Amino acid sequence: STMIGRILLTVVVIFRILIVAIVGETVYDDEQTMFVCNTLQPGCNQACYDRAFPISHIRYWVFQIIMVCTPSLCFITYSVHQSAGISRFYIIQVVFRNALEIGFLVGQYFLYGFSVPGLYECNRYPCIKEVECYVSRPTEKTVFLVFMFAVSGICVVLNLAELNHLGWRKIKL
Amino acid sequence: STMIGRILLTVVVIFRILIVAIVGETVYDDEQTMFVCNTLQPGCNQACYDRAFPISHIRYWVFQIIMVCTPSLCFITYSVHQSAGISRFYIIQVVFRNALEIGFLVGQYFLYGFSVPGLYECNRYPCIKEVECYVSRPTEKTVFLVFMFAVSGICVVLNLAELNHLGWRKIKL
Amino acid sequence: STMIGRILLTVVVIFRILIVAIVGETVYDDEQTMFVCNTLQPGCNQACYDRAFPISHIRYWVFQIIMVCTPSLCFITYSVHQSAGISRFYIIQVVFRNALEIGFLVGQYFLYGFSVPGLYECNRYPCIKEVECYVSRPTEKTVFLVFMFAVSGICVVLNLAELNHLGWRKIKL
Amino acid sequence: STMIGRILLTVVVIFRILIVAIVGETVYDDEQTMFVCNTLQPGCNQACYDRAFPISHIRYWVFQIIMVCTPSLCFITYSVHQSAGISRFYIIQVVFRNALEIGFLVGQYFLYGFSVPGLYECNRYPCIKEVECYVSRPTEKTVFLVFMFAVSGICVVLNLAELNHLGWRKIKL
Amino acid sequence: STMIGRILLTVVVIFRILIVAIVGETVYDDEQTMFVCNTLQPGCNQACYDRAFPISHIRYWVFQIIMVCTPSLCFITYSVHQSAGISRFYIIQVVFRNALEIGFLVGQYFLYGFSVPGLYECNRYPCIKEVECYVSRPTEKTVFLVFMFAVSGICVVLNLAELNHLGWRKIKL
Amino acid sequence: STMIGRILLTVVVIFRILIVAIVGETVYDDEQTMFVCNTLQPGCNQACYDRAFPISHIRYWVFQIIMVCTPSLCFITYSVHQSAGISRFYIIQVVFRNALEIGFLVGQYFLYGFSVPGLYECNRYPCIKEVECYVSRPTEKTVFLVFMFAVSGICVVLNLAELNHLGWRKIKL
Ligand SMILES: C=C[C@H]1CN2CC[C@H]1C[C@@H]2[C@@H](O)c1ccnc2ccc(OC)cc12
Ligand SMILES: C=C[C@H]1CN2CC[C@H]1C[C@@H]2[C@@H](O)c1ccnc2ccc(OC)cc12
Ligand SMILES: C=C[C@H]1CN2CC[C@H]1C[C@@H]2[C@@H](O)c1ccnc2ccc(OC)cc12
Ligand SMILES: C=C[C@H]1CN2CC[C@H]1C[C@@H]2[C@@H](O)c1ccnc2ccc(OC)cc12
Ligand SMILES: C=C[C@H]1CN2CC[C@H]1C[C@@H]2[C@@H](O)c1ccnc2ccc(OC)cc12
Ligand SMILES: C=C[C@H]1CN2CC[C@H]1C[C@@H]2[C@@H](O)c1ccnc2ccc(OC)cc12
């Protein structure tokens, strides 16, 4: 049952790309304009927002998508050159795809966790002592985070199934 | 009378996609900037808006559209793979489409109801006791909600008609 | 003269679609941001604007365009299905197009009238008693309304001419 | 010399379309947000702006372009219909194009004049007595107005030359 | 060595078009929003900005690009018409291109100079006596101005080289 | 193996172009609106922002991408011209590409360094003495800077490998 694996993998990849490309930018549009802190100190908003969200989720997901798609591009361009052998490059492509997917999933978990809290406690200069700041659309962002994690997990499972189907003896050679 | 069913189903799907893609983003553009609460507490607006609208209607509808279209994509890519059998995958595709459509309709009803009230009563921290907040374009959003519900219901009816036409004996086998 | 009527009908349909798609969104961009009421009560602007304009003109016109174009799409997809009889579906398509056009014209008249006044008197909660609100670009909106009404009337006349040419005896059967 | 007349006419039409489509929207983006009146009365800005600029230049020019292009569309669709005679429709097309171009040029002159003043005197309700308002980018708008007038005049001259070349005897018949 | 001249000319033209189309609009987006004058007089900002920048650089460059490309369009359409002689139109096309390029370069120099100062002294009504106004991103605009001047100069040199290659005897005839 | 070297070079070039075109504009959208200085002097924000960021990173990267792609365009157009010899232009194209890449990398290092500080100290007129200003999203910009530097370094290494493979004897001739 390897053909169904590839079918589902392609469908899931397209689904993830479409969802991101259509809604991600709109969800994270006013992340900084609607981020407000309870203070009068100029520049506290910028520092506290920067500490709270070092990298926006959408940038990370775009980078992940492009990086995960890279090996297929490598294989396609190698095939194009080879005309005007290919049974070995495929195994290395699969291995690299597996590694990249697993790494990106683990990185997302270690970077963002599983939820976006509605309050933040900030103690960065120039803010005096400790201040409280309020986030925009925490619930929608939490839902988006969980959904992306689930899709990435499905992709990882399918890739592992494909790699196992190929077998360890072929991978070693 | 199965051909007219498929014709109407395709027309309705295209109609829904076009309507959403053309007007949905514009309708819900200033949902948060025009949402105002009667208070002086910083951060009350963000919390009350997040509680009032955990997920925007437009994103739910986009997700529904992509998810409902997925099975056709799976069938098409399976057909492409088969060339360079198909009379059985079709039944499962129809069943899954029916299930997804019914589930999404029920979920919409249980999430949003049938109207968008013009006032909201919010008692979430940091707001003090109860505060009153005012929504933007409640009537247009109500009309959009009802129209989308009606279109989804028509799609459900057509899908059920198709499934019944196929017959229970074929579905069992 | 049915064929020359068809030529004119196609030209006017394309003209209407182009005009809407190019200028409608820009005209109605700042309808709510520039709508101001003479009061200090929070939330009066939102309620009064919602009462004044339950549905924006542009969205109504987009819906009308798609709905009017639907029957041609149904006929085209039926023709595609028939290959890989057609002289009867055409009459029903014409009748439905006529009915839809007339209904949309009447609905526009009953919903918006023939002008957009520059002042509005609003007595909706939370506004205290009666307040006065001021509209944005009333004259441009009036011109747009009249122009769309005229184009729709021309389309109705051409459709009626075509239906009359087909004759009542054919329509009956 | 009819070859060069048609060549220049086509080039000029394309030039005008490109210039409008590329710069018109950007020039007139902040016409109303940067329009300011010297008063404290709410609603005076809206009324005075509406009186000063009943119709924006860009929308008038877009309407003119589409209307002027319409006869060519009619001729092309008639030619398409005729396949799956044409030596007469061409003369009427030319006459209608000439009439439309001349009418639009005269209308522009009578609507906007030749310059956009930097100050406006407004005495419209609710403004008290007479107030002074200030326009945004008057000089760029004046340049755009003059350039469009010159291009339209060139088009009119070329169309008149073409019509004269056809001759009065043919036009009469 | 004429082929290299044409190759470099085409490459430079494409380079200029790409650079403008990609960055010009973004650079000059907030030219008027961030232009601030030290005064309390309403309407002083509009008048002083209009006096400082009668025409934005980006619009001048767009006009220059289209005008310079026009003669090639004229030649191409003449060639297209000629099928369903050409060795003479080419010389006039080259001469007109040279003249247009030189004229636009000189006009840019006489209009904008070589730098955008960071301060402006304005004495236009309604501003009282002299006021000081501050520009947005003077350095980026200076860099853009110098770069465009250099590219236009390279184009002028290449066009002059081509024209000289053709020779004076051929041009005279 | 330059074959796989060229494969990797093409893949990394496409990767860089995609990343820039998709995220660069969004990251640097509100660079100036969110830049705030601790002062009351009008015009201090503009001057201090201009001194802090003479040229935005995104524009520099766009210019670098187009300039680096230019030699391939020159070679392609020369090949097109040659039809309706080519073994020497390739070496010069490679040399020029190497030089451009190295120059742009060095320029980026000397212009921006390796980090974007969160505070800036500004002493430019009209600001009185020395003032403190606060940057927007310093961490995301630092990450972007480092990532672009790494990608450019990889491209430089691959280009150097290709040039070395071609050999010094061929380059000399
Ligand atoms: C005018 C369009 C702009 C809007 N987004 C930012 C740059 C462009 C395009 C891009 C988006 O439409 C988009 C298109 C295609 N693929 C995408 C893939 C990912 C993505 O992530 C935000 C956005 C994508
Ligand atoms: C510059 C264009 C941007 C505007 N919207 C957000 C990202 C892109 C595209 C998309 C919209 O045009 C759009 C296009 C196509 N299909 C769509 C399907 C659904 C949709 O839901 C809002 C929007 C769609
Ligand atoms: C980035 C582009 C966005 C701008 N408008 C909203 C969603 C998209 C597209 C659409 C408009 O360009 C448009 C395109 C094509 N047909 C249209 C038909 C009707 C229409 O009514 C406003 C707008 C149309
Ligand atoms: C996202 C794109 C939007 C920007 N303008 C408003 C609606 C759309 C398209 C249109 C413009 O690009 C445009 C394209 C093509 N032809 C045009 C013709 C005239 C025009 O006048 C403003 C604008 C045109
Ligand atoms: C949604 C897109 C809009 C953005 N700019 C204004 C109108 C349209 C297109 C245009 C720009 O993308 C553009 C495209 C193609 N050629 C251009 C050539 C010149 C240019 O100068 C600003 C802008 C160009
Ligand atoms: C409506 C679209 C506008 C958005 N950006 C500014 C002008 C246009 C296009 C461009 C961007 O989509 C884009 C497209 C394609 N290639 C690009 C390459 C580089 C780039 O750097 C910001 C932006 C690119």
Author numbering:
A (entry chain D), B (entry chain C), C (entry chain B), D (entry chain A), E (entry chain F), F (entry chain E): 19 to 102, 194 to 282
Give verbatim lines from the article.
Dysregulation of Cx36 is associated with epilepsy, traumatic brain injury, and ischemia, and elevated gap junction coupling in these conditions contributes to neuronal death.
Cx36 with and without the drugs (1 mM) was analyzed by cryo-EM, yielding four reconstructions: Cx36–mefloquine (Cx36–mfq), Cx36–quinine (Cx36–quin), Cx36–quinidine (Cx36–quid) and apo-Cx36, at 2.14 Å, 2.73 Å, 2.9 Å, and 2.49 Å resolution, respectively. In the case of the quinine- and quinidine-bound Cx36, the drugs are somewhat less well resolved at the nominal resolution of 2.73 Å and 2.9 Å, respectively (compared to mefloquine in the 2.14 Å cryo-EM map). Nevertheless, the density map quality allows us to model the drugs based on the observed features confidently. Thus, the binding of each of the three compounds creates two hydrophobic rings in the translocation pathway in the GJC. Moreover, in the case of quinidine, the drug in the observed conformation completely closes the pore.
